[PDB]
Design a protein around this ligand. Sequence first.
Ligand SMILES: [Mg+2]
Ligand SMILES: [Mg+2]
Ligand SMILES: [Mg+2]
Ligand SMILES: [Mg+2]
Ligand SMILES: [Mg+2]
Ligand SMILES: [Mg+2]
Ligand SMILES: [Mg+2]
Ligand SMILES: [Mg+2]
Ligand SMILES: [Mg+2]
Ligand SMILES: [Mg+2]
Ligand SMILES: [Mg+2]
Ligand SMILES: [Mg+2]
Ligand SMILES: [Mg+2]
Ligand SMILES: [Mg+2]
Ligand SMILES: [Mg+2]
Ligand SMILES: [Mg+2]
Ligand SMILES: [Mg+2]
Ligand SMILES: [Mg+2]
Ligand SMILES: [Mg+2]
Ligand SMILES: [Mg+2]
Ligand SMILES: [Zn+2]
Lengths: 68, 57, 221
Amino acid sequence: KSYTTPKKNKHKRKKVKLAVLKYYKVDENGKISRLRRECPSDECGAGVFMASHFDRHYCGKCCLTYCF
Amino acid sequence: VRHVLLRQGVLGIKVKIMLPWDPSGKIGPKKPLPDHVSIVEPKDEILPTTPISEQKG
Amino acid sequence: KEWLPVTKLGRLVKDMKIKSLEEIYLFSLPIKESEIIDFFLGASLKDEVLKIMPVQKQTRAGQRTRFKAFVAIGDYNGHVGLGVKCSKEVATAIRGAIILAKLSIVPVRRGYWGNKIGKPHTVPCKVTGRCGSVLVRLIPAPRGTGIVSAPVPKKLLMMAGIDDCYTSARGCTATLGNFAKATFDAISKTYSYLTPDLWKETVFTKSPYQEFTDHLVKTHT
RNA sequence: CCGCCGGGCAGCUUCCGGGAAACCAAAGUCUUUGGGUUCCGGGGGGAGUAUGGUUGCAAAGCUGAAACUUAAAGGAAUUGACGGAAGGGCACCACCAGGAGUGGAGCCUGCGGCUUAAUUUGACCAACACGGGAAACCUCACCCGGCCCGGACACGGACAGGAUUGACAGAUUGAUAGCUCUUUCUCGAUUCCGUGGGUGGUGGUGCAUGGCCGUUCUUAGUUGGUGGAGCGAUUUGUCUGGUUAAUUCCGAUAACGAACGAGACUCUGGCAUGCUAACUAGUUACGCGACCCCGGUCGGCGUAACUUCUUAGAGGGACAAGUGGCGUUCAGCCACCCGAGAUUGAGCAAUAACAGGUCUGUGAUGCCCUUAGAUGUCCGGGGCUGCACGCGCGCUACACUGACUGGCUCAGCGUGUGCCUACCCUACGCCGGCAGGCGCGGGUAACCCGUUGAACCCCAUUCGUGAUGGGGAUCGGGGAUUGCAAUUAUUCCCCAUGAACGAGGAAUUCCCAGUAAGUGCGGGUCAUAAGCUUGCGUUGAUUAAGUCCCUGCCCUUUGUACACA
Ligand SMILES: [Mg+2]
Ligand SMILES: [Mg+2]
Ligand SMILES: [Mg+2]
Ligand SMILES: [Mg+2]
Ligand SMILES: [Mg+2]
Ligand SMILES: [Mg+2]
Ligand SMILES: [Mg+2]
Ligand SMILES: [Mg+2]
Ligand SMILES: [Mg+2]
Ligand SMILES: [Mg+2]
Ligand SMILES: [Mg+2]
Ligand SMILES: [Mg+2]
Ligand SMILES: [Mg+2]
Ligand SMILES: [Mg+2]
Ligand SMILES: [Mg+2]
Ligand SMILES: [Mg+2]
Ligand SMILES: [Mg+2]
Ligand SMILES: [Mg+2]
Ligand SMILES: [Mg+2]
Ligand SMILES: [Mg+2]
Ligand SMILES: [Zn+2]
């Protein structure tokens, strides 16, 4: 009826952007390099980028990992 | 036997209706009550006091 | 819905051969049907529920409560009845008390105090009513005194139309049933008192049962 | 002997009348209040107490307060309840005659207690093998840790210049939970951060409730309408008597007509050589086939009749009908013939109720609880099983009326492949001593398991009165089966181990005809599975056809200072 242990957060989505700032680099002219490494995945060849989290290496959607 | 919800509590209602007897069976039941002997009343005919015949054809 | 009458006096009064209930009071016939009274008096006959009294007998499992209602009815000119009815629920006790009170309307003699100008106002003499232990004494009064009483004989006298009266009660008047039907007994025997203007020896009239004995052969057997 | 008169104790009857009523020819002639006159009461207690007077030899008597305390004390009558009050009757939840026992022993299970992180909890005749409560996980509520949100919606923040969804590494953890710390990737308006506000609980409260059940209460009891009595609560009907299992009837009668309960009913048990019919049941004949010395056996094969057996529908049948007694000669009872039965057994079952049980059956539920650090839910582990003790329900026993080992020969209830649901009943053939394992098959079922080849029983062996071949508790080891997982042995098997127990103290439970009891087989529980419970057959008695003595129940009368009785 009337509850004992009450709610905290759920598991969130996300607002402070242009997260693409930190994968691509340009100069003032036609020069397009990339900060972060590209996924060799079979489902997506060149679109999906690998990861920057918190120690090592990884990618997210097919979740395939690169380490030392 | 059905419930009523209230602000104060819960109420219960039993409605029990004894249906009347009918030969049709669309209003109530077909069978009479097992202790209801309904005799038929005799139609009244006179006894004849002289033997008479009924020839014809 | 219609009133199919059972008794003989009721058959006459719905066949409209009795002019008013004063002649069935004259012959003192037993009224045992309630429709007679709100036939002659149904316009102005008012009711009061004096009290709802919950008596209870005691059975094997618990206590068997039955409500007993007191209903005093009467038009405000010359008639009162007092009905007492015990039943399981208060509504049907009240309805049965109304039909007993209509059954037991008794006509009210009321007369004067001193000089006899006008329309009568008090009881004709000093009368008493006793039942249980309570004695209720009704006394003539000058005009405009009002009824001086308790609320219950106050209300039965004012619906008798005794619009002024001096009352004195003795006994255990707290018991409402005895106090009410004692008051009704005093109002009732106002006519049974023998007053000196009633010494003309009575020219006896035809009885209703005798005067309409051919109609009472024809219209039902 | 029959009257009359006066007064005397009385009585009966009565709508004189009176009274709160019991009642009373006075307790009447009282509010319609007055014949005459003494004595005396003023709520209940304190109290006929103290003190004073007076009397007495004394005990004591007459006069006789107050302080103080108290909301009732009391009278008459009604209805219940109660009675170690009476009169009738009734029941193996009572007794008698008995039978099987229980209580004694081991063990199974529930309960109190003890112990513990927890050993959750409901209930103490009418709780205690009850919650369909036989819990390894789930159940699960309890305990110890860890995830998730399963914050709907609205308002305002910050806001496709992305609040961080999910996340293998590696630390941490129990866990390959990204739960959280050290590359911030993929995802792309779902949503959060405050704010209100819902939602969920096997949390509390059955003493807020419904519903359902149990019980008072398995007995015969209960209530209106009108009429009678009484001021009234109430009573009458609903009863003297007989009779019945029965407030069941005959019948009496200020009651008449009615309703519920009993009965009636419904299912079941029993009887049909008459009906209806049967390749999902059979019988008999017939023809083959097998066997034995024309015949006999065959659940061997196939079909010409029939429905006795079996299935199951309509009917039928038994009604105290008939006879002899008993009784108002009514209601009915007893006996006997005829006969399948001359009381089979159950289900439903009233008015009024208990603060009986259930919020732990529910999305039936009022109110209250607690505002991440779950009493929601999920997962991992434990516990619900813990053992100095006491109790209840039960199983096995204490042997020869037996055990063991062969052999022989008989049932009826039923159930069976699932919505999720992934787990069914199993014949037959191989392997293994058993537990079981492996193959192919039948069955959504009168088809297959299945002619259900069940036990006890019966027959034949061994045992020999010895805690013995009774008993099988406890306990070591090994093998199987279900399961994600068996340790606190889940269950089954094999071997070995062999406790108490010599018929149970006071006390006590159930029962009377296919009944008690012995004996196994089905259902529920169930993945595994019955020492329970619900059903079922099988073998089948002793005693009794009665009583109120005990325990209680019903009706009448009477008594009450009882009425949470
Ligand atoms: Mg006086
Ligand atoms: Mg006094
Ligand atoms: Mg009293
Ligand atoms: Mg008996
Ligand atoms: Mg005995
Ligand atoms: Mg014991
Ligand atoms: Mg024992
Ligand atoms: Mg178990
Ligand atoms: Mg568990
Ligand atoms: Mg758990
Ligand atoms: Mg709930
Ligand atoms: Mg209760
Ligand atoms: Mg209670
Ligand atoms: Mg609190
Ligand atoms: Mg338990
Ligand atoms: Mg042995
Ligand atoms: Mg031995
Ligand atoms: Mg007993
Ligand atoms: Mg059980
Ligand atoms: Mg006495
Ligand atoms: Zn990738």
